[PDB]
Amino acid sequence: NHFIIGTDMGLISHGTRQDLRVAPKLFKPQQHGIRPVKVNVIDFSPFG
């Protein structure tokens, strides 16, 4: 039910399906400005 979505603007958002207010935060490195790095591959570590 949880998922993340990346955009060309250099940010990745978090969300889910059932409860849409659990943690509506975004992911960002320790950077400033924008840095539209145009994220193109997302994966998940297959572990606990």
Partner: protein, 332 residues
């Protein structure tokens, strides 16, 4: 650490300056009062040759004298004197005397004299204070063959009743009917035209209020938030029936009992404050909410997102009307 101790000595003990020896465990509560922007109060009490400060206020004492500090500003300004940002007020640890003296001596004459011409609600607040202190003052100042029969008869009934917490909700739903009947019967013209009004109403008021406290406790032990709602619904409905049934029979039967069996001065009038009525409605609202939710649950594939999310959204809402509820902050 200057004003706090100085005032403590001035009120409790020797009217002088305490030695600069802040070597007590109570110094932490003092430091919290000063520095913590949330701690707007600090209680002090004189112990056995000792001083005890605590942010927590407790009223277990019987008739002791305490003093409470009250802060004006969010945080203490240490550079300024510790008496230019703090108020003090003494009070007795007596649920009757303290309110009586405090209201009568301080608040009633203060509002009467110290009133701004442009502020409203003053005459209402004045009336409230007057009625309040009056009631407290009243409490603060507080053939034997027939007398023995009455005592023995009603004492037996009262003691049989007093073992109420030992009964479940599913049983007291029927007790309300039996108790109302038997109590109204014994009041009848048996050995005397009419027993003095004192117990005539007092016993019924105790019995009615006792059902209130009974249901309030028993519904709390249902955990009206947990998963086993099946059993809760059964016991909850019983709690409502107890509350409503007693009120209905009281209001109906009183009209005829005081005309047919006991020549009581009151006729075609009721006595019971009907506090059970509000308690019953409280449970009815809970039942309706839980029932509606269960109905939505049957349609869980239709409103999955709403049902799951709203459950936890509504939990802090329900927390505004806890178990053992008393409607003294009902607007919340």
């Amino acid at each position: 650490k200057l004003f706090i101790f100085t005032t403590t000595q001035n009120y409790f003990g020797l009217m002088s300056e305490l030695w600069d020896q802040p070597l007590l465990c109570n110094c932490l509560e003092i430091n919290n009062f000063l520095d913590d922007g949330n701690q707007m109060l600090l209680r002090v009490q004189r112990s056995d040759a000792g001083i005890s400060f605590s942010n927590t206020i407790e009223f277990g004492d019987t008739k002791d004298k305490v003093l409470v500090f009250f802060k004006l500003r969010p945080e203490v300004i240490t550079d300024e004197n510790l008496h230019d940002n703090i108020l003090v007020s003494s009070m007795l640890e007596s649920p009757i005397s303290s309110l009586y003296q405090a209201v009568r001596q301080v608040f009633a004459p203060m509002l009467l004299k110290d009133q701004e011409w442009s502020r409203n609600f003053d005459p209402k607040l004045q009336n409230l204070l007057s009625e309040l202190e009056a009631g407290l003052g009243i409490v603060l100042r507080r053939s034997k063959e027939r007398a023995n029969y009455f005592k023995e008869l009603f004492e037996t009934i009262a003691r049989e009743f007093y073992n109420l917490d030992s009964l479940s909700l599913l049983e007291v739903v029927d007790l309300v009917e039996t108790t109302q009947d038997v109590v109204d019967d014994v009041w009848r013209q048996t050995e005397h035209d009419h027993y003095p009004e004192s117990r005539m109403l007092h016993l019924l008021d105790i019995i009615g209020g006792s059902f209130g406290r009974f249901v309030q406790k028993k519904l709390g032990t249902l955990n009206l938030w947990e998963d086993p709602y099946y059993l809760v619904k059964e016991s909850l409905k019983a709690g409502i029936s107890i509350c409503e049934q007693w009120v209905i029979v009281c209001n109906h039967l009183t009209g005829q009992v005081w005309q047919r069996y006991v020549p009581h001065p009151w006729k075609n009038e009721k006595y019971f404050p009907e506090t059970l009525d509000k308690l019953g409605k409280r449970l009815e609202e809970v039942l309706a909410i839980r029932t509606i939710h269960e109905k939505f649950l049957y349609f869980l594939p239709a409103s999955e997102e709403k049902i799951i999310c709203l459950t936890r959204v509504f939990e802090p809402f329900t927390g505004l009307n806890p178990v053992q509820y008393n409607p003294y902050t009902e607007p919340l």
